[PDB]
């Protein structure tokens, strides 16, 4: 996509009342907007080429 | 974002007819079907009806069977509605709404559209 | 159909404090173990917003707004109430057509 240089993205869980520390001088990809976890329950990650039907 | 842009405000003699338009922006206009809501002035809201762009499926309430009908012009991706032979009773706002998914909720509202029946 | 009655009609509330409104439905808005309500705020002069859905989860929604429920009868609870609250709410089920909404409240702000 016309870049050459590479972005390394990461992630954690942050626990409810533990606290994450940021130390950088530099090449650091900031985090804005975290998700709280809301609802824990079972679920799936589909893979399929379809779209929505509007039915249930 | 899911910017739906409708028809401006618009009046009509008792007994004609009017045909307000919803132009949606911003998703894929076959993946949800598209209502219409009608506010009788600061009071309550009223289900008017839906329709399901990508293949024109209609569903109405009982109140709006007649005088309503709902249309989809998929190349325009946008939505409209008709109301033919109007009275004092239709003098109201009238908002273009998309529903996420029969057990649905309406999460993106527009603007509304605001109908006068007066000669 | 499946009639949706709210209350209070209207409702004064002390800025900072606790609003609670409640719905009845006429028969239950309620199977597969979830709840199909919907809570609805209309600030005024403008459209109506989406709040909750399925009577307890938040949509950009603060948690000031409590969704509870179950059954046959709900409640939004807006605590504390702020200054940008003041709206009609409106309860409306999903569980079978036609659709059907809440007559609606109107919340004003004691100052």
């Known amino acids: 996509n016309g870049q050459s240089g590479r972005m390394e993205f990461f992630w954690t869980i942050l626990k409810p009342n533990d606290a994450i520390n940021f130390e950088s001088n530099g090449n650091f990809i900031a985090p804005e907007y975290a998700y709280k976890i809301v609802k824990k329950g079972d679920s799936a990650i589909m893979k399929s080429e379809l779209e929505y039907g509007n039915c249930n | 974002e899911v910017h739906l842009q409708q028809s401006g405000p618009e009046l009509v003699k008792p007994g004609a007819s009017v045909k307000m338009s919803c132009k949606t922006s911003?998703?894929?206009?076959?993946?949800?079907?598209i209502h219409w809501m009608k506010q009788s002035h600061g009071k309550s809201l009223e289900w008017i009806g839906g329709?399901?762009?990508?293949?024109?499926?209609?569903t109405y309430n009982q109140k709006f069977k007649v005088r309503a009908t709902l249309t989809v012009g998929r190349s325009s991706s946008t939505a409209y509605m008709d109301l033919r032979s109007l009275t004092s009773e239709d003098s109201a706002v009238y908002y273009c709404?998309?529903?996420?998914?029969?057990?649905?909720?309406?999460?993106?509202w527009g603007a509304g559209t605001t109908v006068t029946v007066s000669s | 159909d499946i009639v949706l009655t709210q209350s209070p009609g209207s409702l004064t509330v002390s800025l900072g404090q606790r609003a609670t409104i409640s719905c009845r439905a006429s028969?239950?808005?309620?199977?597969?173990?979830?709840?199909?309500m919907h809570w609805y705020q209309q600030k005024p002069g403008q459209s109506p917003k989406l709040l909750i859905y399925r009577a307890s989860n938040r949509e950009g929604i603060p948690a000031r707004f409590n969704g509870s429920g179950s059954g046959t009868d709900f409640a939004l609870t807006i605590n504390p109430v702020e200054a940008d609250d003041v709206a009609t709410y409106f309860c409306q089920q999903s569980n079978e057509d036609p659709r059907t909404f809440g007559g609606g409240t109107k919340l004003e702000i004691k100052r």
């Open positions: 028969e239950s808005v309620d199977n597969f173990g979830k709840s199909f």
């Open positions: 329709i399901f762009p990508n293949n024109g499926d209609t």
């Open positions: 709404v998309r529903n996420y998914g029969s057990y649905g909720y309406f999460d993106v």
């Open positions: 911003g998703y894929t206009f076959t993946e949800y079907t």
